[PDB]
Amino acid sequence: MWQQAIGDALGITARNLKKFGDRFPHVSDGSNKYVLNDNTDWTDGFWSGILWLCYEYTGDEQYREGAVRTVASFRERLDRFENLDHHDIGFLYSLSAKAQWIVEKDESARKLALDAADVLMRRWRADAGIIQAWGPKGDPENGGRIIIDCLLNLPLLLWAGEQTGDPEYRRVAEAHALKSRRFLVRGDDSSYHTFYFDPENGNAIRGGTHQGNTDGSTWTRGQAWGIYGFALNSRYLGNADLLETAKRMARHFLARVPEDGVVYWDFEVPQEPSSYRDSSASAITACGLLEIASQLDESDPERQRFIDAAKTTVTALRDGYAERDDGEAEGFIRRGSYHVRGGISPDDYTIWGDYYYLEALLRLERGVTGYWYERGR
């Protein structure tokens, strides 16, 4: 079943909240403890998301109150504009502020999410037709660079558009999603991690990565962002081409899943136990597979195959990577990897991996779909 798997996450989270205090987990670094920050990275929202998911599952207010405290932290982060000059505003605010709006319709949370969407819109570069991933506008190196994870940040914009009625949100999100499909996805259904465009006109320059093994390899977390990301955008935009792309990327991913059911950090490196894994890529994909399935007609025989593939992925994670609540462990799943090439936490907990693992469990057990879009939209 999924209840006991969720149970370990619930225990770990309740204990973590009392240990972390108002701090946020990011990744572990050689031990079963998370390295923490004061809401200054791109991953802080995943902690908020975990707290909200735990609350939705239990109705236990210790989780809600912790989540509300993180939302207060995000309100302050925005007012001080601390490290928000990047495109991961969605990861940060959809899972915290927007989540509170989805869970209990808190108007102040809704305002914060909209204020955040406004900030993300500031990353749009009209001349290049893209949302700049990192660095200040005009950055000589990153001024016209997009990264595939931006796809999961578009939901914040799409949601804001549906809340305000301002067509500009959807226009920008749609343009970026389509440009990502054309240049980040490859002809063999694999994908580039990032792509560079001329800041002045938007002409395509080249694809590449600082995380994947090589510019032309297939970094598994990147492939995973594509699977879930394109599916989330296909739902909002009602675009069958984006859904087709998510399915193509999903099949490419699934065909390269190793024996134990959890992927290595890159598909183009030795696929043997000696290579680092990335349990987070498998967790993200599990959610993406379920999102894809939810958009297919029940008469489609592949719908059940996507659902079963997701269940198989979650089972593989639970059996070979999930941590039991032993009163010490602070993460849900082991062997995630942050930056293998840089030697940064290559075999550790990753808060995003934990969030997606828990979202997959909630999707399977309660039909709870997270905070990328309004329930039963």
From Swiss-Prot:
Temperature dependence: Optimum temperature is 45 degrees Celsius.
GO molecular function: chondroitin hydrolase activity
Its EC number(s): 3.2.1.179
Active site: D88 (nucleophile), D149 (proton donor)
Record Pfam families: Glyco_hydro_88 (PF07470)
Domain of life per record: Bacteria
SUPFAM superfamilies hit by this protein: Six-hairpin glycosidases
Main localization (coarse): cytoplasm
Top-level EC class as recorded in UniProt: hydrolase
Description of activity control: Partially inhibited by divalent metal ions such as calcium, copper, iron and mercury.
Comment on pH dependence: Optimum pH is 6.0-6.5.
Catalysed reaction, written as an equation: beta-D-Delta(4)-GlcA-(1->4)-beta-D-Glc-(1->4)-alpha-L-Rha-(1->3)-D-Glc + H2O = beta-D-Glc-(1->4)-alpha-L-Rha-(1->3)-D-Glc + 5-dehydro-4-deoxy-D-glucuronate
One Gene Ontology term, aspect cellular component: cytoplasm
Subcellular location: Cytoplasm
Family: Belongs to the glycosyl hydrolase 88 family.
PANTHER family for the chain: HYDROLASE, PUTATIVE (AFU_ORTHOLOGUE AFUA_7G05090)-RELATED
Quaternary structure and interacting proteins, as annotated: Monomer.
Function: Catalyzes the hydrolysis of oligosaccharides with unsaturated glucuronyl residues at the non-reducing terminal, to a sugar or an amino sugar, and an unsaturated D-glucuronic acid (GlcA), which is nonenzymatically converted immediately to alpha-keto acid.
Name used for this protein in its record: Unsaturated glucuronyl hydrolase
Organism: Bacillus sp. (strain GL1)
